[PDB]
Amino acid sequence: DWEIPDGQITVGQRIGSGSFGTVYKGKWHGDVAVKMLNVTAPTPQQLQAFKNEVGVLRKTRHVNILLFMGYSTKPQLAIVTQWCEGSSLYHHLHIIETKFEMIKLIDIARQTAQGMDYLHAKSIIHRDLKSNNIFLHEDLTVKIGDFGLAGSILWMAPEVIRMQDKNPYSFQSDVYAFGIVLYELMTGQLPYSNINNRDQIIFMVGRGYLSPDLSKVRSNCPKAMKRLMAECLKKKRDERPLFPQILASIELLARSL
Ligand SMILES: Cn1c(Nc2ccc(C(F)(F)F)cc2)nc2cc(Oc3ccnc(-c4ncc(C(F)(F)F)[nH]4)c3)ccc21
């Protein structure tokens, strides 16, 4: 079992604060991170989502997936994971503008792909893969998490952005978010930088009038990688490759550098 007996977790510095969640740096057999719920009495829907998150996390045991460590019900609903040292891929690329060498960029892609393939094998759809959810641990290991606390439309596949079905979320949807993550790694930028209207980005991506400008890729970006990016970003979801095949392509281009 993974229930941490109450009076063990020492919640400390509030690192992130959101609408429902609040992440704290903590202490439980060393430094840990604690996702918590603000309320003293939780909603039956809140208790379900906590049960679901812990449910997903207890199915994961992989280096590219954030280490689930335990849960706690009393006093507040809390999910304990490892504490990570460093910053998210988003922070690196877009906040502090870290200039990674092409070889590292491809490795960050390979690691994200590795973690993605694991989740998909375990029939887990992330639904929200983005650079803010890729943690570059000890500055070298990708750790896929859910560092969000609330949409994030830049990584959404046209079929998702359209909401033309009850569940438009697929393994393919995640492949498109991965495609956008590759665009970030290879351009050092977010897509649709020149468009200042969210609703229009939404409208156009859905209608397929707008796609990421692949000409923005770094000069040293391998032709194979740019091709892979293009496949991951296909408007038609059936045309998108899956992570076993994505991994294969990344690992191959990595060898030719
Ligand atoms: C419960 N829960 C999850 N859920 C999750 C669900 C599914 C999956 C998957 F299965 F789909 F993979 C993966 C994760 N993700 C989390 C992320 C959390 O934040 C953390 C964790 C570790 N370190 C930090 C940090 N270190 C330095 C800094 C900074 F930013 F302050 F510098 N922040 C921050 C806390 C709790 C988290």
18 is in an annotated binding site: yes
Domain residue spans of the chain: 1-85, 86-257
Q: Cβ–Cβ contacts within 10 Å for residue 187, how many?
A: 20
CA distances from 185 to 132, 172, 180, 182, 188 (A): 13, 20, 9, 5, 5
Specify the ligand 1 atom closest to the Cα of 35: 36
Residues 86, 190: Cα–Cα separation, whole Å: 21
215 is in an annotated binding site: no
CA distances from 83 to 27, 135, 170 (A): 9, 11, 30
Which one-letter DSSP state was computed for residue 13?
Answer: E
Q: Which of 62, 40, 81 is nearest to 124 (CA)?
A: 62
CATH superfamily, with its number, for domain 1-85: Phosphorylase Kinase; domain 1 (3.30.200.20)
Catalytic one among 128, 139, 174, 213? Answer: 128
Q: What is the DSSP string of 122-163?
A: TT---S---GGGEEEETTTEEEE--------TTS--HHHHHT
Residues 257, 255: Cα–Cα separation, whole Å: 6
Top CATH class, 86-257: mainly alpha
- Three-state SS across 46-96? HHHHHHHHHHHHCCCCCCCECCEEEEECCCCCEEEEECCCEEEHHHHHHHC
Residue 128: active-site member: yes
- Residue whose Cα lies nearest atom 34 of ligand 1: it is 33
- Residue whose Cα lies nearest atom 17 of ligand 1: it is 147
Resolution of the solved structure (Å): 3.2
Residues 155, 176: Cα–Cα separation, whole Å: 7
CA distances from 114 to 41, 60, 119 (A): 39, 13, 9
- Residue whose Cα lies nearest atom 15 of ligand 1: it is 146
112 is in an annotated binding site: no
Method: X-ray
The reply to whether 1-85 and 86-257 are identical in fold is: no
User: Which residues pair with residue 3 across a beta bridge?
Assistant: 71
